[PDB]
PDB file of C-alpha atoms and ligand atoms in Angstrom:
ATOM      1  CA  UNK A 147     -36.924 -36.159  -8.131  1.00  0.00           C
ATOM      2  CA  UNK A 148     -36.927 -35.343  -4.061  1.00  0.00           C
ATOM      3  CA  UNK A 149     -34.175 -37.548  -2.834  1.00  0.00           C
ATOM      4  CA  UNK A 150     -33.239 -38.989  -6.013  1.00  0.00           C
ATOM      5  CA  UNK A 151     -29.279 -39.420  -6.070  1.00  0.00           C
ATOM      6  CA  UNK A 152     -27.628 -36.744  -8.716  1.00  0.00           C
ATOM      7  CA  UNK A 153     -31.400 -34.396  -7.549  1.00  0.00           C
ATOM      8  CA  UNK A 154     -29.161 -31.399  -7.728  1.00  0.00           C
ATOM      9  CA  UNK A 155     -27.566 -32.806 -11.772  1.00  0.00           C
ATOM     10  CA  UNK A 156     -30.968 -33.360 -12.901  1.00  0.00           C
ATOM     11  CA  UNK A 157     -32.558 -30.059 -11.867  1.00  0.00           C
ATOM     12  CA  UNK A 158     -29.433 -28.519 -13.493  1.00  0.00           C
ATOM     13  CA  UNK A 159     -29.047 -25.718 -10.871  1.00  0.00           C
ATOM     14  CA  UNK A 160     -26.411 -26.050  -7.865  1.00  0.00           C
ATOM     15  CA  UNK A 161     -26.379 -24.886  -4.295  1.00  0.00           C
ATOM     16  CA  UNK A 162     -24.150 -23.055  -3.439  1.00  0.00           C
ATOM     17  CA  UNK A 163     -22.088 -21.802  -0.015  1.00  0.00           C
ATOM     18  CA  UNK A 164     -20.589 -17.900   0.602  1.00  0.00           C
ATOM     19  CA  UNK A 165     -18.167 -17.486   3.208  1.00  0.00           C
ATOM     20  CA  UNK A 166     -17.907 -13.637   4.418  1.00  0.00           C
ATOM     21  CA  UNK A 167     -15.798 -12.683   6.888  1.00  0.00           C
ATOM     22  CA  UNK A 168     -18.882 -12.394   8.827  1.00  0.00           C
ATOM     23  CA  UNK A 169     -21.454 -15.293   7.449  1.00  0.00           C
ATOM     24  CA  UNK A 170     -21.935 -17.914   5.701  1.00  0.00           C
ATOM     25  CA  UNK A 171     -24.634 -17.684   3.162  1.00  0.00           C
ATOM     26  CA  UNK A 172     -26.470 -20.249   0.736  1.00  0.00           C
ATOM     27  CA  UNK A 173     -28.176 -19.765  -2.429  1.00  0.00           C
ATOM     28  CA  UNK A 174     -29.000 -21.547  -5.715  1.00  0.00           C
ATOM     29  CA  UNK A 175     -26.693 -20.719  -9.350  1.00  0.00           C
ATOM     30  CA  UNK A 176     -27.415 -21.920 -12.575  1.00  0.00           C
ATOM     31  CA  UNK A 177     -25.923 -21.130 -16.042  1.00  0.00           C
ATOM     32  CA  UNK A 178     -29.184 -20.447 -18.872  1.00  0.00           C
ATOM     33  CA  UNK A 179     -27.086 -20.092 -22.014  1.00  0.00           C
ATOM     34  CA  UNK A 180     -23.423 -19.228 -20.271  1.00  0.00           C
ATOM     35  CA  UNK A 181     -25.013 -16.832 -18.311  1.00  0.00           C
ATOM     36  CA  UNK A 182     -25.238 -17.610 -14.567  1.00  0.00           C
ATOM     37  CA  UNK A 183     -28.636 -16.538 -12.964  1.00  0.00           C
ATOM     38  CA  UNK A 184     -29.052 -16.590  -9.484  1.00  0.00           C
ATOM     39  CA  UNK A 185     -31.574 -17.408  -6.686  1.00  0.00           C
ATOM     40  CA  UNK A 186     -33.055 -13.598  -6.809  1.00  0.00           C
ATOM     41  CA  UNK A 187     -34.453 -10.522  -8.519  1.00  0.00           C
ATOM     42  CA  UNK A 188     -33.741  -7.364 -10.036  1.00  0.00           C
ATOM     43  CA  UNK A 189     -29.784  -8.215 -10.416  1.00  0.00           C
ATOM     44  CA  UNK A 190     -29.783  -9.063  -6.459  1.00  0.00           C
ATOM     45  CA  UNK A 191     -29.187 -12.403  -4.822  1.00  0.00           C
ATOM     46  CA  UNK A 192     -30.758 -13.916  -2.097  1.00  0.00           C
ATOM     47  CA  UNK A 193     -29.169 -15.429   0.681  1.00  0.00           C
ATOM     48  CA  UNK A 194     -29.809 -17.502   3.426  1.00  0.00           C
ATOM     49  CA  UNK A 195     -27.927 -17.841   6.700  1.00  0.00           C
ATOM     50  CA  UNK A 196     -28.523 -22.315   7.193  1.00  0.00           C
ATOM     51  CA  UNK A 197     -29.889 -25.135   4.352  1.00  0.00           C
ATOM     52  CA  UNK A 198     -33.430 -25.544   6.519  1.00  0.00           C
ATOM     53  CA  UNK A 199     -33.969 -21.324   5.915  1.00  0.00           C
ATOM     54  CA  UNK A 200     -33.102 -22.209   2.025  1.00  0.00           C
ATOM     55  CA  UNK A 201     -35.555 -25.299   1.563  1.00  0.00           C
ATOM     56  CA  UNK A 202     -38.371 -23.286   3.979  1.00  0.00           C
ATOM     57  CA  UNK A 203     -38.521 -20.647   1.117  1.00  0.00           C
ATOM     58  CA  UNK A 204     -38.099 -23.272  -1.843  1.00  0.00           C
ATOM     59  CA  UNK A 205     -41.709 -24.457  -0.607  1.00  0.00           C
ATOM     60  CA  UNK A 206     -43.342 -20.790  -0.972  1.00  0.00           C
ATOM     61  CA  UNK A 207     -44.659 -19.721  -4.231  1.00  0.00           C
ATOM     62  CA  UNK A 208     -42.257 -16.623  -5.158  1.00  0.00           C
ATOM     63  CA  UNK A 209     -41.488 -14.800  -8.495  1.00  0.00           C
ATOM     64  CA  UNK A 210     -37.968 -14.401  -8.960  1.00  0.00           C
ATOM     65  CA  UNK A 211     -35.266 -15.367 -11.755  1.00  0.00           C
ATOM     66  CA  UNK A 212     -35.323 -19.002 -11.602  1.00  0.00           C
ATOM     67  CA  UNK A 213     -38.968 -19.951 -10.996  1.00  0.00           C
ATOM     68  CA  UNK A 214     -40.100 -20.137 -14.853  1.00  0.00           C
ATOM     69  CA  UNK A 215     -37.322 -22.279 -15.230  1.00  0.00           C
ATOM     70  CA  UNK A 216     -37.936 -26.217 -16.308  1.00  0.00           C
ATOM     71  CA  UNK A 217     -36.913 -28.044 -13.586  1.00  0.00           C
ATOM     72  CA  UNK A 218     -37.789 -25.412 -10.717  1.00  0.00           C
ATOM     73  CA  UNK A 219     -41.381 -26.959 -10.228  1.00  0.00           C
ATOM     74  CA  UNK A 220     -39.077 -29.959  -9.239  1.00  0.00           C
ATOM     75  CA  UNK A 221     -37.100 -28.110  -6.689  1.00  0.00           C
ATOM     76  CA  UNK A 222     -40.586 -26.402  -5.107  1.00  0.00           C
ATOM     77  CA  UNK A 223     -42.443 -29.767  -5.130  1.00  0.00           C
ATOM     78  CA  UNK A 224     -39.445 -31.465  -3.416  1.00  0.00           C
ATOM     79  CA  UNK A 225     -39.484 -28.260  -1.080  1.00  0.00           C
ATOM     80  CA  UNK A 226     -43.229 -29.438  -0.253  1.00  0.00           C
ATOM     81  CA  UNK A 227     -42.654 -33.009  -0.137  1.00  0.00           C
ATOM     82  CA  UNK A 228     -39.955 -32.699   2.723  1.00  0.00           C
ATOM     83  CA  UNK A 229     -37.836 -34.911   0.258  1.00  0.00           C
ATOM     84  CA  UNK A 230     -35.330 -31.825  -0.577  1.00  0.00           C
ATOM     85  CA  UNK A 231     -31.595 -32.029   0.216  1.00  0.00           C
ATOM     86  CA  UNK A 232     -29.745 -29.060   0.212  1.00  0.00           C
ATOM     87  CA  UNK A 233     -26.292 -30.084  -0.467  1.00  0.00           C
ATOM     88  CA  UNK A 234     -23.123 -28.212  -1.569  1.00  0.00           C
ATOM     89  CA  UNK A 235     -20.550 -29.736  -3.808  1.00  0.00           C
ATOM     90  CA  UNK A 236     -16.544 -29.008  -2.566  1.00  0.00           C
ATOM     91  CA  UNK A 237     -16.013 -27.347  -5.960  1.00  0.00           C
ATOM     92  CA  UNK A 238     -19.516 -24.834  -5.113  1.00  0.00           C
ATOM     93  CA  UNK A 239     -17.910 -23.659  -1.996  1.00  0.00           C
ATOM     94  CA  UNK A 240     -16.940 -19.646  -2.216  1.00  0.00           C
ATOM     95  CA  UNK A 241     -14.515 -18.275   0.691  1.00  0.00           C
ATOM     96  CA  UNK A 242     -14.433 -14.723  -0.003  1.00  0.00           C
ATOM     97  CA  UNK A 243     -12.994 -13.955   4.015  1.00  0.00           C
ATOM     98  CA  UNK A 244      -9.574 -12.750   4.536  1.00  0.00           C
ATOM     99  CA  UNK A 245      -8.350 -12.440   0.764  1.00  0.00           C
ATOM    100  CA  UNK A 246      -8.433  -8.598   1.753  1.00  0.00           C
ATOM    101  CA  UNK A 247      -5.641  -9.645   4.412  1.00  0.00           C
ATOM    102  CA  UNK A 248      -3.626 -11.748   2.185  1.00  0.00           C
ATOM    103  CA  UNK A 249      -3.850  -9.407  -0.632  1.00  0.00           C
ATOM    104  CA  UNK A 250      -2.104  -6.962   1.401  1.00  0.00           C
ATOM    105  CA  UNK A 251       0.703  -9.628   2.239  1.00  0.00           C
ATOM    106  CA  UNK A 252       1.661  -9.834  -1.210  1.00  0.00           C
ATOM    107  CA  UNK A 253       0.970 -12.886  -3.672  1.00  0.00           C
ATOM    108  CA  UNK A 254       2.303 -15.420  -2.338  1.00  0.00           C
ATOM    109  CA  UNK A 255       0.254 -15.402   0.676  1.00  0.00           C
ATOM    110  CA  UNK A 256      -2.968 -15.522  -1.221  1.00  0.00           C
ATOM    111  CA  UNK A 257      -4.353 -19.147  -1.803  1.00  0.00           C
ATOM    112  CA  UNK A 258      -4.415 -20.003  -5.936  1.00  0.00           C
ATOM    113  CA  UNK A 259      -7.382 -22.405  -5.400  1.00  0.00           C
ATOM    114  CA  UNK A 260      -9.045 -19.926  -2.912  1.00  0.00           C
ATOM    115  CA  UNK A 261      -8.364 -16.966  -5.291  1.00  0.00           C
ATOM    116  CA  UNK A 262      -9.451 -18.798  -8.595  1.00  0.00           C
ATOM    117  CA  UNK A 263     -13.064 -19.403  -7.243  1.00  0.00           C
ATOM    118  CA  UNK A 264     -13.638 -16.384  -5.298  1.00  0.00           C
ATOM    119  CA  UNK A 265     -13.111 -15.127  -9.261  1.00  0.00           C
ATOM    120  CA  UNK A 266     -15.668 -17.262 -10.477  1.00  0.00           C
ATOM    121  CA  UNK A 267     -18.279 -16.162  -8.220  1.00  0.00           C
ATOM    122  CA  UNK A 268     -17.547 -12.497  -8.624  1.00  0.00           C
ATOM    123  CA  UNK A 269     -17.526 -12.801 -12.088  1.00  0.00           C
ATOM    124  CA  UNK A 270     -20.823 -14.935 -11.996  1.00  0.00           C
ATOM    125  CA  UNK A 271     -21.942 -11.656  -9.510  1.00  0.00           C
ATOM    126  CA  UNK A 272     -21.192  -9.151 -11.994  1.00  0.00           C
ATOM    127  CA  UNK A 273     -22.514 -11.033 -14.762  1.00  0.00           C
ATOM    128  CA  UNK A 274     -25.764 -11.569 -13.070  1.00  0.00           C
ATOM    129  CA  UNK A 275     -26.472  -8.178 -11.795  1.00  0.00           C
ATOM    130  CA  UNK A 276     -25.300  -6.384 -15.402  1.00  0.00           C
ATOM    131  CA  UNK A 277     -22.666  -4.422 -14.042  1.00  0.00           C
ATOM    132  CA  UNK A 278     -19.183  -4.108 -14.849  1.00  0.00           C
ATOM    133  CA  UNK A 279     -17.271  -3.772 -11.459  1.00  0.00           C
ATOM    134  CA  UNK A 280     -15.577  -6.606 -11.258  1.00  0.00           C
ATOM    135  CA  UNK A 281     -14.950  -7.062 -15.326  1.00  0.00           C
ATOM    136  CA  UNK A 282     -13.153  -3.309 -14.814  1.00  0.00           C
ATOM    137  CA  UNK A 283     -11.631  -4.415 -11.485  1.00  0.00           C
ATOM    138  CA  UNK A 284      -9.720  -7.195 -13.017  1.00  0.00           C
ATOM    139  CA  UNK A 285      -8.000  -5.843 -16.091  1.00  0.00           C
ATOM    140  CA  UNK A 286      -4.474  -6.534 -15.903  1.00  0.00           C
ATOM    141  CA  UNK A 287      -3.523  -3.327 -16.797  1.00  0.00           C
ATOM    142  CA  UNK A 288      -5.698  -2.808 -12.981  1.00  0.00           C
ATOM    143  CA  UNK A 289      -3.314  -3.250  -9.854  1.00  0.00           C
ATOM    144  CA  UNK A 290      -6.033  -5.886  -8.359  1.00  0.00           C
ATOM    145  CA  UNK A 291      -6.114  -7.392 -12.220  1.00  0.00           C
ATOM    146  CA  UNK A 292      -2.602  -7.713 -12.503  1.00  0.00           C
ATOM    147  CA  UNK A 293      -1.871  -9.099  -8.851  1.00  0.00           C
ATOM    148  CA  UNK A 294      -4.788 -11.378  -9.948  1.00  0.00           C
ATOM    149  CA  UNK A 295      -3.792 -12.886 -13.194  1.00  0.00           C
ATOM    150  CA  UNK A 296       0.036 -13.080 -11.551  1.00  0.00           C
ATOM    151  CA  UNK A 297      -1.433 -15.377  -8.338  1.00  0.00           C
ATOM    152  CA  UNK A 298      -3.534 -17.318 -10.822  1.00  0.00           C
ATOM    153  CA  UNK A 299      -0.963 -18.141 -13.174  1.00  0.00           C
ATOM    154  CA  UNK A 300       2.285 -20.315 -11.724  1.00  0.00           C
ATOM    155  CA  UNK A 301       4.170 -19.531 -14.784  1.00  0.00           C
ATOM    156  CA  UNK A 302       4.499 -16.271 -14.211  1.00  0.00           C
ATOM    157  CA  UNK A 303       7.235 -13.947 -13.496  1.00  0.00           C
ATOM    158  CA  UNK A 304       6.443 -10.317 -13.668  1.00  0.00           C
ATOM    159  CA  UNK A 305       6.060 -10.627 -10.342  1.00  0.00           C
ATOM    160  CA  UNK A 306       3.999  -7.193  -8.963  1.00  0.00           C
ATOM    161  CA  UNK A 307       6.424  -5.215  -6.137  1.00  0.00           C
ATOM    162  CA  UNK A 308       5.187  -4.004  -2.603  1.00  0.00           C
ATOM    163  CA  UNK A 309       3.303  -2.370  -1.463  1.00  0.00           C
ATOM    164  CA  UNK A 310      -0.033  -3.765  -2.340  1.00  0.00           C
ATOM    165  CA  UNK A 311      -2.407  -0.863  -1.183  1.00  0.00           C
ATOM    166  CA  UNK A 312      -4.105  -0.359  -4.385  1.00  0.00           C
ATOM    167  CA  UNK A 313      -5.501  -3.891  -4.653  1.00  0.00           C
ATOM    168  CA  UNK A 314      -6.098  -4.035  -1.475  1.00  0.00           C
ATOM    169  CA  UNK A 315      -8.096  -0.996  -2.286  1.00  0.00           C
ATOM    170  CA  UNK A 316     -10.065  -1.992  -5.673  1.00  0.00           C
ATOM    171  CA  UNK A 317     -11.033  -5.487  -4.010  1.00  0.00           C
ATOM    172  CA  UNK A 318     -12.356  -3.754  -0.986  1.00  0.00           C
ATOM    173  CA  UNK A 319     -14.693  -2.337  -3.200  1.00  0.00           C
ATOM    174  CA  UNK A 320     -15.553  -5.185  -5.156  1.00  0.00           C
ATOM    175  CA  UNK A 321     -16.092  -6.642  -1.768  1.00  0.00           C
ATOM    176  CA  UNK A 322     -18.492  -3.550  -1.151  1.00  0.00           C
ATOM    177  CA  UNK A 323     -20.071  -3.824  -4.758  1.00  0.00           C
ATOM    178  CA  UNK A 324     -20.919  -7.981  -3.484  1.00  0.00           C
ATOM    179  CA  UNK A 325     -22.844  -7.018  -0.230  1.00  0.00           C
ATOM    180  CA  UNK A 326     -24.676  -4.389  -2.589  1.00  0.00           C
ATOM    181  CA  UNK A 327     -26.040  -7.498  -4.478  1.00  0.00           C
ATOM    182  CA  UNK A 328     -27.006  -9.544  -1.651  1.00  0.00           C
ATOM    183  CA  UNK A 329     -30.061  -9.480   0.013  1.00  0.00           C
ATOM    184  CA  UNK A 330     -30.917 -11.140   3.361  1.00  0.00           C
ATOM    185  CA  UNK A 331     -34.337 -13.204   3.921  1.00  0.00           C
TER     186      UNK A 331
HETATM  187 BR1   BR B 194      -0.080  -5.297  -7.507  1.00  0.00          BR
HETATM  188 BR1   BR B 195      -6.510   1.896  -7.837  1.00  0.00          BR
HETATM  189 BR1   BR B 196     -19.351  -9.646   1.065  1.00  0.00          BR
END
């Protein structure tokens, strides 16, 4: 453990980057049992605006979701050891900015790979913090949900028809719902 290649494998909980359209925020994800749990408490994440600010608060004894888990007295004790390496995979990066924009442009300006894991993490967000925002938000019979599953899915022809202002809509809420469940340290 510390700066053991495959540190972030072994622990079995991955760093992860947010991109808002006004930071970018990192924070630690697992999945106990399919469920994802967070770097947080009481359904609320906590984020951190650089790597150093996330490894400075790794080192501090704190009570929060993931600290009973197995391998988090392997994350602190690297945290103390100054042998922690904060490091974020391609396929942990989350770009939540300007989907609101592109949304409103219609589906085929909205990136697939972009779209498909901004969906993850919201999912992963609603999941976490028990409520059912973004499960509702995404229904296809939903206009967000149906715009959704159409961008997602290149074999797909029921193509939704201008204008877009009710997704644009529901995912400015969602996007409301995420700041909700983030909190700033
Ligand atoms: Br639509
Ligand atoms: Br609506
Ligand atoms: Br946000």
């Amino acid at each position: 453990l510390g700066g053991d290649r495959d540190f972030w494998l072994q622990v079995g909980i991955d760093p992860i980057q947010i991109m808002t359209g006004t930071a970018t925020f990192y924070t630690l994800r697992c999945y106990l049992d399919d469920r994802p749990i967070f770097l947080g408490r009481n359904g609320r994440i906590s984020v951190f605006g650089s790597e150093r600010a996330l490894a400075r608060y790794l080192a501090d004894e704190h009570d929060h979701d993931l600290s009973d888990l197995s391998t988090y007295d392997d994350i602190r004790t690297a945290a103390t050891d100054g042998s922690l390496a904060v490091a974020v995979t391609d396929d942990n990066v989350y770009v939540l900015s300007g989907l609101v924009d592109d949304f409103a442009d219609g589906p085929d300006a909205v990136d697939r790979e972009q779209l498909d894991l901004a969906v993850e993490l919201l999912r992963d967000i609603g999941d976490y913090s028990e409520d059912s925002a973004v499960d509702k938000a995404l229904e296809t019979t939903r206009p967000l949900g149906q715009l959704v599953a159409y961008v997602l899915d290149p074999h797909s022809v029921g193509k939704p028809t201008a204008p877009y202002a009710a997704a644009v809509r529901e995912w400015e809420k969602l996007e409301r719902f995420v700041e909700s469940r983030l909190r700033r340290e």
